[PDB]
Amino acid sequence: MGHHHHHHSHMGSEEDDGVVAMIKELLDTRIRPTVQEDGGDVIYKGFEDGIVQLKLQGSCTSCPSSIITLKNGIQNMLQFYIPEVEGVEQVMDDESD
Numbered sequence: 001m002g003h004h005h006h007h008h009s010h011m012g013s014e015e016d017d018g019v020v021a022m023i024k025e026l027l028d029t030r031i032r033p034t035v036q037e038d039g040g041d042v043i044y045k046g047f048e049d050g051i052v053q054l055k056l057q058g059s060c061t062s063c064p065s066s067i068i069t070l071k072n073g074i075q076n077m078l079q080f081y082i083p084e085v086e087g088v089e090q091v092m093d094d095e096s097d
Contacts, residue, residue, distance in 0.1 A: 011046075019084055020047050026081065027054075031074050035060055042074065045093055050086035052078055055093045 014020045024044050031042050040060035045053040054074065060066045067090060075088040 014046065015048065016084070019082055023047055023052060023078060023082065023085075026078060027074070030077060035070065038066075042070075043093075045091050047085075050084055052085055052088045053091050054088060056090050061090070061092070 027042055027044055035041050035057070038059045040057035043055040043057070045055055047053070052074070054071075056067065056070065060070050071088050071090055075085065078085040078088065
């Protein structure tokens with residue numbers, strides 16, 4: 001790339017990486033397996049302003065009811081351990097569109 005080499009922000013060491021990291025495992029252990037059995041998956045996009053941003057894959061995102069049910073299930077699970085989670089947001093993050 002060009003002679004810039006400057007980052008305004010950085011992942012890994014994020015806003016409260018303690019919360020961020022335990023969300024990653026709460027997905028990978030509890031949520032991701034369940035969604036994958038239905039024929040989808042959840043990709044952790046981040047945690048910002050108390051909003052856990054997740055990319056939803058097919059089957060789950062294909063049916064509008066399944067979007068709401070999945071988002072709410074993940075939300076309530078995360079809120080139980082982490083009261084910092086006020087919300088969860090479905091972000092279709094894929095630059096092919």
